[PDB]
Amino acid sequence: GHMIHKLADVQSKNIGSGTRIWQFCVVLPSAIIGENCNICSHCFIENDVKIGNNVTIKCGVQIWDGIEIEDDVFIGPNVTFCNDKYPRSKQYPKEFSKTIIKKGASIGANATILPGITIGENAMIGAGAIVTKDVLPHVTYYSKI
Amino acid sequence: GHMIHKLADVQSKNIGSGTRIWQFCVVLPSAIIGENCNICSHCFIENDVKIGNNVTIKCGVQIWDGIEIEDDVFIGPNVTFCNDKYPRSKQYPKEFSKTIIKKGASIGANATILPGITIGENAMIGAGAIVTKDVLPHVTYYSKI
Amino acid sequence: GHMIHKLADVQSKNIGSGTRIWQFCVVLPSAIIGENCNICSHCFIENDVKIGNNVTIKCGVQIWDGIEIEDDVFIGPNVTFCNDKYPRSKQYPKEFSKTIIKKGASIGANATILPGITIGENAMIGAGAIVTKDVLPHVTYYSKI
Numbered sequence A, B, C: 001g002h003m004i005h006k007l008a009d010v011q012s013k014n015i016g017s018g019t020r021i022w023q024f025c026v027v028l029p030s031a032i033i034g035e036n037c038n039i040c041s042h043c044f045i046e047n048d049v050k051i052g053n054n055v056t057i058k059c060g061v062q063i064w065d066g067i068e069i070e071d072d073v074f075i076g077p078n079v080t081f082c083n084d085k086y087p088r089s090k091q092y093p094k095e096f097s098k099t100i101i102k103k104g105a106s107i108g109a110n111a112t113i114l115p116g117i118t119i120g121e122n123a124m125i126g127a128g129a130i131v132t133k134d135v136l137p138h139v140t141y142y143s144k145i
C-alpha cells in the first residue's frame, strides 16, 4: 500500500504502492500519483495532475491543474510552477496552460517554471533558475547571476 | 459568511463575506481581510496587515507586518515579501518598512519583493522577479536571466 | 523551557531554553536547536542538522541533512538550501554535501543556497540571490537583475 501521514489532507484514492505523502500536504481528489513517490511536507497537488512512478517532490512545491510529471523526475524544494501567463485575480482562463516535466528530468531548488513549458527527459534545471522557454532533453540550464 | 478550513489557525475576526482560508494557514488577530478573497494553503498573515476585496493569495505566501494589499490583487505562489532591509537576528527596527501592492496588480510565482516597495495599480511582476525599486502603474517588470 | 506549538510535529528533544517552534513545522529526532531560536511556521528541519543560539528561521524554510547554522544567524522566509549538486530521483549520494552559515550571517528572503557552501560570519545575502560560491565574512552579496 501507500503511506499518508495523519497530518496530510489527501483526498485522492489514485495513489500507487510505496508512495509516501508527508505532513501538511494537500492532495485534491482527481490527482494521479504513481508508485514509490516521495511527496515531502508542505506540498499542494491539485486535481488535473498526473505524477508518474519514482517521483521525488521536495518540500514546499505546488503542482497545479495542467501539470504532468513523468517517471523518475526530481523536483527540488520550493520549486514553483504555473498555469496562467497573465494572471489577474478572478479572471479564470477557459483552459489552463499545460506544463510537462519529462522522464528523469531534475528541477533544482527554488526554480521557477513559467506556464506552457516542456522540460525534456533527463534535463537538469539549476537551483534558482527561471525557465521561460522549453528545455531540451539532457540539457543543463541555469539563469545568469 | 466566510470559510475557514478546520486545518487553518485563523485568529482574526476581521474577515469579509465570501473569503476562503485554506489548510495550514496562520492568520494573526489584527489581520484585516476583505470580501471574496482566496487565501490558499500554507500562507502566513501577520497582525499589521490589510488585504482588500477579491484578492487571490496563492500557496506558500507570507504577508508581514507593514504590508498592505489593495482590491483585486493577485499574489502568485511562493511570492516573498519583506519589511526589514538589513536583517540581523533579534535586532528589531523601531518601525517596519511598509510595502503596498496597489489595486489590480499581479505578482508572478516566486517573485521577491524588497521592503518599502510600492507596486502600482494593474502592474504585472514576472515570475521569479526581484523587485528592488517601485514598479509604476500598469508596467510589466521582470528580471534579466 | 521551550515552546512547541500543538500544530507542529517536533520529534527532537534537543531544543534549547527560550526556543519557539511555530505551526506546521516538522523537526526530525536528531536535529539540535540552541536557545532563544524562533522557528517560524511551515519549516522543515531534518536529522543531521545543528542550529545555534538566537537563530531566526522565517517561514517556509527547509534545513536539510548536512546543514549547520551558527549562533545569531537570520534566515529569511522561503530561503532554500541544498545538499545534492546533481540530484536524480532515488540516486542517494554516499555523503550529503555540507553547508555552514557562520555566526551572525543573514540570508535575505527567497535566496537559494547551492550545496557545499560556506557563508562567512556577519555576511548579508540579498533577497532572491543565488549563492553558487562561498561568501566571505562581512560581505554583502546579491545577484544581478
Ligand SMILES: CC(C)(COP(=O)(O)OP(=O)(O)OC[C@H]1O[C@@H](n2cnc3c(N)ncnc32)[C@H](O)[C@@H]1OP(=O)(O)O)[C@@H](O)C(=O)NCCC(=O)NCCS
Pocket: A076, A077, A107, A108, A109, A124, A125, A126, A127, A128, A129, A140, A141, A142, A143, A144, A145, C081, C082, C083, C084, C085, C086, C087, C114, C115, C130, C132, C133
Ligand atoms: C546547475 C548545476 C547542476 C551546475 O553544476 P556544474 O555544471 O558543476 O557548474 P559549475 O559548478 O562548474 O558552475 C559553472 C558556472 O555556472 C554557475 N552556476 C552553477 N549553477 C548555477 C545556478 N544554479 N544558477 C546560476 N549560476 C550557476 C557557477 O557560478 C559557475 O560560474 P563561473 O563559471 O562564472 O564560475 C548546479 O550548480 C545546480 O544548480 N544544481 C542543482 C542543485 C539542487 O538544486 N539540488 C536539489 C536540492 S539539494
Ligand SMILES: CC(C)(COP(=O)(O)OP(=O)(O)OC[C@H]1O[C@@H](n2cnc3c(N)ncnc32)[C@H](O)[C@@H]1OP(=O)(O)O)[C@@H](O)C(=O)NCCC(=O)NCCS
Pocket: A081, A082, A083, A084, A085, A086, A087, A114, A115, A130, A132, A133, B076, B077, B107, B108, B109, B124, B125, B126, B127, B128, B129, B140, B141, B142, B143, B144, B145
Ligand atoms: C512577465 C510576463 C507576463 C511576460 O510575458 P510576455 O510579455 O508575453 O513576454 P514574452 O513571453 O513575449 O517574453 C519576452 C522576453 O522576456 C523574457 N521573460 C518573460 N517572462 C520573464 C520572466 N518572468 N523572467 C525573466 N524573463 C522573462 C522571455 O524569456 C523573452 O525573452 P527573449 O525576448 O529574449 O526571447 C510573463 O512571462 C510572466 O512572467 N507571467 C507571470 C506568470 C505567473 O507567475 N503566473 C502566476 C502563477 S500561474
Ligand SMILES: CC(C)(COP(=O)(O)OP(=O)(O)OC[C@H]1O[C@@H](n2cnc3c(N)ncnc32)[C@H](O)[C@@H]1OP(=O)(O)O)[C@@H](O)C(=O)NCCC(=O)NCCS
Pocket: B081, B082, B083, B084, B085, B086, B087, B114, B115, B130, B132, B133, C076, C077, C107, C108, C109, C124, C125, C126, C127, C128, C129, C140, C141, C142, C143, C144, C145
Ligand atoms: C542586499 C541589500 C542588503 C542591499 O541593500 P543596499 O546595500 O542599501 O543596496 P541599495 O538599496 O543601495 O541598492 C544598490 C543596488 O543593488 C541593487 N540591489 C539591492 N538589493 C538587491 C537584491 N537583493 N538583488 C538584486 N539587486 C539588488 C539595487 O537595485 C541597486 O541597483 P542600482 O545601483 O542599479 O540602482 C538589500 O537590498 C537586501 O536585499 N536586503 C535583504 C532584505 C531581506 O531579505 N530581509 C529579510 C526579510 S524582511
Ligand SMILES: CC(=O)N[C@@H]1[C@@H](O)[C@@H](OP(=O)(O)OP(=O)(O)OC[C@H]2O[C@@H](n3cc(C)c(=O)[nH]c3=O)C[C@@H]2O)O[C@H](C)[C@H]1O
Pocket: A022, A023, A038, A039, A040, A041, A056, A058, A076, A077, C026, C028, C046, C064, C081, C082, C083, C084, C087, C088, C089, C090, C091, C092, C093
Ligand atoms: C535537499 C534535497 O532535496 N536533497 C535530496 C534528499 O533530501 C533526498 O531526497 P528524498 O526525498 O528522496 O529523500 P528520502 O530519504 O527518500 O526521504 C526523506 C525526505 O522525506 C520527507 N519527509 C520525511 C519525514 C521523515 C518526515 O517526517 N517528513 C517529510 O517530509 C523530507 C525528507 O527530506 O535525496 C535526494 C537524492 C536529494 O537530492
Ligand SMILES: CC(=O)N[C@@H]1[C@@H](O)[C@@H](OP(=O)(O)OP(=O)(O)OC[C@H]2O[C@@H](n3cc(C)c(=O)[nH]c3=O)C[C@@H]2O)O[C@H](C)[C@H]1O
Pocket: A026, A028, A046, A064, A081, A082, A083, A084, A087, A088, A089, A090, A091, A092, A093, B022, B023, B038, B039, B040, B041, B056, B058, B076, B077
Ligand atoms: C498557478 C496559479 O496560481 N494559477 C491561478 C489558479 O490557481 C486560479 O487561482 P485561484 O486561487 O483564484 O483559484 P480558485 O479556483 O478560486 O481556487 C482554487 C485554489 O484554492 C486553493 N485551495 C483549494 C482547495 C480545494 C483546497 O483544498 N486547498 C486550497 O488551498 C488552491 C487552489 O489552487 O486562478 C488564477 C486566475 C490563476 O492565475
Ligand SMILES: CC(=O)N[C@@H]1[C@@H](O)[C@@H](OP(=O)(O)OP(=O)(O)OC[C@H]2O[C@@H](n3cc(C)c(=O)[nH]c3=O)C[C@@H]2O)O[C@H](C)[C@H]1O
Pocket: B026, B028, B046, B064, B081, B082, B083, B084, B087, B088, B089, B090, B091, B092, B093, C022, C023, C038, C039, C040, C041, C056, C058, C076, C077
Ligand atoms: C519579514 C521578516 O522576516 N522580518 C523579520 C521580522 O518578522 C522579525 O522576525 P522574528 O521572527 O525575529 O520576529 P518575532 O517578533 O520574534 O516573532 C514573530 C514571528 O514568529 C512567527 N510566528 C509567530 C506567531 C505568533 C505565530 O502564530 N506563528 C509564527 O510563525 C512568525 C512571526 O513573524 O524581526 C526580524 C528582525 C525581521 O527581519
Ligand code: NA
Pocket: A078, A110, B078, B110, C078, C110
Ligand atoms: Na521560493
